Amino acid sequence: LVHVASVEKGRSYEDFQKVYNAIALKLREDDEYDNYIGYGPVLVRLAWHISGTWDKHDNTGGSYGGTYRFKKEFNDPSNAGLQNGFKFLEPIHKEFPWISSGDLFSLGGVTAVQEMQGPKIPWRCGRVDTPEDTTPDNGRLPDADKDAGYVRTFFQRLNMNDREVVALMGAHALGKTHLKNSGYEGPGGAANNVFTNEFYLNLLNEDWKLEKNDANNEQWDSKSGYMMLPTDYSLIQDPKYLSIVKEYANDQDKFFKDFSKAFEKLLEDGITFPKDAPSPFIFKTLEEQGL
Template sequence: MSSVRDYEAVRRDIVAQLKKPDYDDGSAGPVFVRLAWHSSGTYDLESDTGGSNGAGMRYEAEGGDPANAGLQHGRAFLEPIKEKHPWITYSDLWTLAGVVAIKEMGGPEIPWQGGRTDLVDDSKVPPRGRLPDGAQGADHLRFIFYRMGFNDQEIVALAGGHNLGRCHGDRSGFEGPWVTNPTRFSNSFFKLLLQLDWKPRKLATGMTQFVYEDPEAEEDEEPLMMLPTDMALKTDPSFAPWVQRYAEDKDLFFDHFAKVFAKLIELGIQRDAQGVITNTDNRLGGYVSAPKKSSTPTGPSKKGEPRARL
């Protein structure tokens, strides 16, 4: 084990952790992307709180948020890397894992800088309710993303992350993949959103999602699905033109996604001319790495909690 900050070695070890034959679609890539996104998406521009710096999901106050259901698996998959490289902070490890996963799954190269530090306690963990609810519509998306400092084009670009992964009924209440190949980054999400005939379906969980059932599909083949927030993208007059452009131009989407994801994982971080983070807010100063946690997935508390979000 080395104490030298060899981020390239960490990148290689993240790649080695991506293949998971017994997990969703055989890959940890999508859950790594969601982990990076959810650890960053708590940022509030007005109060300058939340964001990836701190890795607050290590504490029940944030990790137990129903919106983060399932992310315990992503965090546990990264624990062997933390054990091998104890110098790296969780906040750097989680964001780097998302960036590496996107690239390895065929997506764009996303700029990434290290230097995030881990909170020393849960006193700075942001309040719950800052992450998007897939059951809502366009107004909700703007409420959530404008709070972070994103505009309508950036909202649509970030939504393209739904090219990856799937929903789970026991986590978000929704069920199924968005695209036919949920471990390959592409602009298929936008193409399918526009091209297919989506029908509403109420699930046993009580949630309503939109599904497309291919009449030529095999009997045991699961249908594709879209969330209410996804459907809002193609009906809202400001979102819809960007859906169309990204469906038609993969390169444009990749370029815009790389920029907005890089912005997402840097929210709330201030750096000096040398790229060193100057607002660590950890009371100890310097690059503070939290000790390794358990490699066993521990999910959010269910007692007394509202339903989970995506």
């Protein structure tokens, strides 16, 4: 497969800035969801799940085709809980019917990180909706009950190296795990709807204890009332992942710069950009616009 990016006909930077402003205004408005965490965390989880199905070997999956709109992908057990981010963006897609699904789903993640005081993520337009028979089969997304070798091996399918994996996982400071969606329960830190380097500081400074939860799954719990998944805790058990974790705990600006590059790469995997294509867009936040 080749998936060549095609710009939505006649659209420019200012058109996309209006879809970004509509998502960001609705993030401001619907601030009560999930005990006042708001929709920012579930929207970056949605952008990572529609992108994490990619396979480098045959170019199938990935954000291009916007195939999470189909029932097979939508009802994947690993996507339980994302129906909420879908329902959030759905009025916005009726307001801007020209935007493709892969572009809206991925831009939702970019808008959420920037509006939660995260780094600026450059974003490129041009994903094209593809037919229901291009929808990936279930089972390409990662398990949480595993170790650092599984994590390393998993992310090699999306050719992410060690530093990209540790930067990307820092998004687990956002939102929380929910027992009815995944069989895990609890948040990763205190500031879970502001983007910071908190995940790394917690993983290095909390007294973590291994316990089984009410779904019979193991997780690491701390005195503070925080939790870590087996795959998260992995990052301090592997010597190569641990030096990068220490680096981001001591330097939030390095973390923001690396998360920015790795997240854009994740959202563009599997897509060919022609060089007549527009350069990546950097969107202004509401605050920068006075809105």
